[PDB]
Amino acid sequence: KSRGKICTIGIAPWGIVENQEDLIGRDVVRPYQTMSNPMSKLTVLNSMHSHFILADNGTTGKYGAEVKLRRQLEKHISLQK
Amino acid sequence: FQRYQLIMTFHERPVLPPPLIIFSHMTMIFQHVCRDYGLKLFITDDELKKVHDFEEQCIEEYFREKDD
């Protein structure tokens, strides 16, 4: 209904994406499928999000790899002038 | 509308006028035994992607403006 863009940023762990592969193309456009399978035990990346920051601690299939980085980024941008 | 046909039919013609076009007719035989612009415009993949993005932005804006 309206023009303009909203700068939505998603800070998600790397181990929960439904396709760890199909995304390894460095500096090149990569297709991505929004269809979900409930038996895959993972979740798909949410569209209508302008930018993503995928943080990985080496694991796969578990959360807790992005809260500290997100809080640190919020603290650093709060102090920005 | 016919301006296009005029421009094209003068783009395809030889340089020399019909009084001395017999020279341009002879040289075609020599090239017989042997369009960067004016018709088309060839671009790389980056410019093609930029043109595609511009066109989809234009059509989205057109539909949004029509609905509003």
Strand partners, A43: A17
Helix (H, G, I), strand (E, B) or coil at A55: strand
Give A26's contacts (C-beta < 8 A, 6+ positions apart).
none
d(CA A43, CA A61) in angstroms, rounded, equals: 10
Distance of CA A33 to the CA centre of its chain: 14
Q: Are A46 and A34 in contact (CB under 8 A)?
A: no
Q: Are A54 and A35 in contact (CB under 8 A)?
A: no
Rounded to whole angstroms, what are the CA distances from A11 to A35, A53, B36, B57?
21, 5, 47, 28
Segment holding A71, helix H or strand E:
helix A67-78
Task: Encode B22-61: b = buried (16+ Cβ within 10 Å), e = exposed.
Answer: eeeeeeeeeeeeeeeeeeeeeeeeeeeeeeeeeeeeeeee
Rounded to whole angstroms, what are the CA distances from A76 to A29, A45, A48?
30, 26, 26
Name the nearest CA neighbour of A43 among A35, A54, A52, A32: A35
Phi-psi region at B17: left, alpha or beta (left = phi > 0; alpha = psi -120 to 50): beta
d(CA B61, CA B37) in angstroms, rounded, equals: 30
- Strand blocks (E) in A1-81: 9-13, 51-55
Resolution value, angstrom units: 3.1
